[PDB]
Amino acid sequence: LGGLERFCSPGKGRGLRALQPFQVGDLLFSCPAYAYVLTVNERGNHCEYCFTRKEGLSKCGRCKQAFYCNVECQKEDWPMHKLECSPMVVFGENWNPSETVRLTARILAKQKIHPERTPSEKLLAVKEFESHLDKLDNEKKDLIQSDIAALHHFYSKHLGFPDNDSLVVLFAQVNCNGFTIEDEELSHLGSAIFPDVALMNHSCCPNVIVTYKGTLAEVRAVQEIKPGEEVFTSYIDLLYPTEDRNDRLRDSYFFTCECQECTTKDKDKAKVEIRKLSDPPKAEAIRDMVRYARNVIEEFRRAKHYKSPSELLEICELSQEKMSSVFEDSNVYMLHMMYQAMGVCLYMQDWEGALQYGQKIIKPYSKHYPLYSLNVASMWLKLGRLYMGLEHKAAGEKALKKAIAIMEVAHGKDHPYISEIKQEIES
Ligand SMILES: C[S@@+](CC[C@H](N)C(=O)[O-])C[C@H]1O[C@@H](n2cnc3c(N)ncnc32)[C@H](O)[C@@H]1O
Ligand SMILES: [Zn+2]
Ligand SMILES: [Zn+2]
Numbered sequence: 116l117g118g119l120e121r122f123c124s125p126g127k128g129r130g131l132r133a134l135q136p137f138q139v140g141d142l143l144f145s146c147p148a149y150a151y152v153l154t155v156n157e158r159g160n161h162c163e164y165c166f167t168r169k170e171g172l173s174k175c176g177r178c179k180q181a182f183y184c185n186v187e188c189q190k191e192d193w194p195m196h197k198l199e200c201s202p203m204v205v206f207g208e209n210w211n212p213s214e215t216v217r218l219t220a221r222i223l224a225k226q227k228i229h230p231e232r233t234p235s236e237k238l239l240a241v242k243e244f245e246s247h248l249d250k251l252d253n254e255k256k257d258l259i260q261s262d263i264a265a266l267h268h269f270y271s272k273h274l275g276f277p278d279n280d281s282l283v284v285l286f287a288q289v290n291c292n293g294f295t296i297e298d299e300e301l302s303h304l305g306s307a308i309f310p311d312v313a314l315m316n317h318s319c320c321p322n323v324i325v326t327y328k329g330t331l332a333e334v335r336a337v338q339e340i341k342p343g344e345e346v347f348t349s350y351i352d353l354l355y356p357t358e359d360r361n362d363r364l365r366d367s368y369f370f371t372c373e374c375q376e377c378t379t380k381d382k383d384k385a386k387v388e389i390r391k392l393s394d395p396p397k398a399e400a401i402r403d404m405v406r407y408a409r410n411v412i413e414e415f416r417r418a419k420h421y422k423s424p425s426e427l428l429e430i431c432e433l434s435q436e437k438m439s440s441v442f443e444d445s446n447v448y449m450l451h452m453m454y455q456a457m458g459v460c461l462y463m464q465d466w467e468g469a470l471q472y473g474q475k476i477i478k479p480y481s482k483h484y485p486l487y488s489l490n491v492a493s494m495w496l497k498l499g500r501l502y503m504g505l506e507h508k509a510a511g512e513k514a515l516k517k518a519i520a521i522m523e524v525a526h527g528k529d530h531p532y533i534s535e536i537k538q539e540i541e542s
């Protein structure tokens with residue numbers, strides 16, 4: 116990592132700082148996955164090995180639950196895939212390790228195959244990851260123990276297990292340092308370890324964005340970075356108010372952020388936009404609605420697992436209409452529910468409903484999110500793809516170009532996603 120260095124960032128543990136200028140769109144560095152796993156729901160849609168999306172992926176003939184571009188990808192994936200190939204046959208319907216277990220199994224396999232420092236650990240090694248072991252409550256430890264039991268239960272034929280203490284440290288490290296890989300529409304693809312990328316601290320006004328080229332992580336400047344400046348990503352969805360962001364940061368990462376966004380709260384008021392109405396909603400009425408909104412968000416998070424698509428849409432409508440007594444359409448809590456509703460429409464292949472939702476989401480998104488934001492870019496892309504399918508060519512092309520302009524900065528001009536999107540314009 117030539118023009119960067121590891122340092123002690125006061126109050127933030129270890130960090131990464133620049134030793135040379137980076138301009139907007141510059142590639143700071145890339146980092147090959149140390150370990151990674153394609154999410155179960157994407158099997159048969161993306162190659163397990165390289166994450167390429169393709170119809171007609173070649174199926175593993177033993178387990179019938181792993182798919183590849185070709186024999187090369189299948190062969191290359193085998194050292195990792197063998198941890199699950201036979202167990203999936205043996206266990207059948209009962210094979211259900213969490214994705215965290217699946218990834219941690221591959222970390223252990225990699226440590227056996229390649230004990231020495233890898234090219235993904237030039238500045239920070241997996242073994243050096245922060246765990247926050249001393250901060251875990253009974254709830255978190257109970258979860259880690261359940262994962263350790265699943266790891267032993269499902270992987271015992273192919274993996275050597277370290278002792279319980281070591282596995283607790285490892286799973287905690289995975290929690291603190293683990294990445295999720297998303298596609299160009301920000302759909303969940305899988306989980307990965309990128310040790311050098313894990314070195315970067317958080318800010319709610321980040322100067323870099325991490326994107327993915329298959330299983331390769333790339334890090335590009337979204338603000339000008341000068342020598343001596345610390346390099347920050349955002350660990351979280353930047354849509355939400357300062358309190359909401361920090362509750363998540365404390366809960367998952369055990370810190371409170373003190374960036375300019377969290378210090379000033381300059382953007383909080385517009386995020387929680389209140390209807391004028393001439394006779395304004397009172398302070399405690401506004402307090403109560405924010406509390407209810409944050410509760411329905413959680414209520415919905417778990418509601419997905421049971422309820423039907425029509426049922427989920429119903430509760431989006433109901434909460435939307437309840438909040439609209441006080442909240443503007445641009446209100447972040449209203450945006451959240453609208454965004455969930457859009458996802459339900461897309462699954463239902465109700466393209467027109469999806470589109471009507473996207474159109475009400477996009478302008479507020481552009482306001483609340485930073486200048487270059489993958490959340491904004493992916494919304495433009497979904498919009499453009501929806502317009503194109505409805506044969507709204509002009510509107511489609513416009514929205515796709517909006518996506519490209521952001522993506523050229525975050526993903527690089529030469530990124531395969533940009534070529535693909537340009538081909539959707541030429542077709
Ligand atoms: C992915 S690690 C980042 C590298 C880490 N600081 C280290 O020394 O290994 C995530 C952890 O870094 C720390 N951290 C990251 N950003 C921070 C910030 N802005 N303020 C305080 N601590 C931060 C927290 O302890 C968090 O759990
Ligand atoms: Zn492949
Ligand atoms: Zn198999």
Ligand SMILES: [Zn+2]
Nearest residue numbers: 319372374377
């Ligand atoms: Zn912040």
